[PDB]
Amino acid sequence: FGSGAIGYEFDNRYLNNQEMSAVAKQRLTSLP
C-alpha cells in the first residue's frame, strides 16, 4: 500500500545524524 510520513521522518533523521557526524570531524587547526 502506501503512507510515507514515518519513512520520511526516519530517513530525514538518519541523514541528520550522518550530517551531524560529518560536522564533528571539522577542525580549524592551530599550528602555524
Binding site: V23, A24, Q26, R27, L28
Partner: protein, 226 residues
Amino acid sequence: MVNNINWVKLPVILDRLLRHPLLTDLNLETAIQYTLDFISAMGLPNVYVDKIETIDIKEYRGELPCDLISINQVRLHKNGIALRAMTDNFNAYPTHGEPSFKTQGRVIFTSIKHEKVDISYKAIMLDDEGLPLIPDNPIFLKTLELYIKKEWFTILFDMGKISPAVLNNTQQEYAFKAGQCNNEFVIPSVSEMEAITNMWNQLIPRVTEFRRGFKNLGDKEYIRVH
C-alpha cells in the same frame, strides 16, 4: 584613548548583525540587553559620561542621583577636600577625623552630619529615547557585534542548531577583538602620555593628589636653577 567617542544610536549595531542570515531574528530589545552586558563586562571608563552634582547630607546620609553608575570622587563643597572611604564598622553610631563616605544603593553614607558634598560620577549616555548610546568606533562596534553573535550562537549550540566548529570560531574571534577593543580604549593618547610623563618624572614626589580632584596630577614638576 586616542580616538574621540562619537555617539551613535543602538540600531547601527543591527545593520551589522542582520547581515548574517542566522542572526535575523534579533531585535532592538535583544540588542539593548546584550549591549549593557557588553558595556559592563569591558568596564571601559571612556564609554561613560562624567557628571558632577552637589547633594546635601542630612545626618550621615544623602540621596544619590538617579543616573549614577560609579563615583569618581566625593568631596566637600565648602572646602573642596576629598573624602576617602568608610572603614569604620560603627560609623554614625554613638557610644554611651578624616572624612569618609560609603555608598550602597541610592544612599551615600558619610562621616559628616550636616554638609553639602560634590559627587563626581559616571552615568550612561542616553538618546532622545531613554536608551543607551554607543560609540561609533568600528573596533567597539565590531566586538559588540561579535559579542551578540557569540551569545546568540551559544544558545543555538545548546539547541543543536550550530556546529561546534562554528561556535569555536565565534568564541575565538570575540576573544581577539575583546582585547583589541580593550587596548583601543585604554592605551593613552599623546596628550595623556604627557600627563603620565609628568606624574612619573618627579624629583620631589607628589604623593597627595587624591586631596585635590587629581587636578595637579599630570602637572609638570619644575626645579629652580641654583
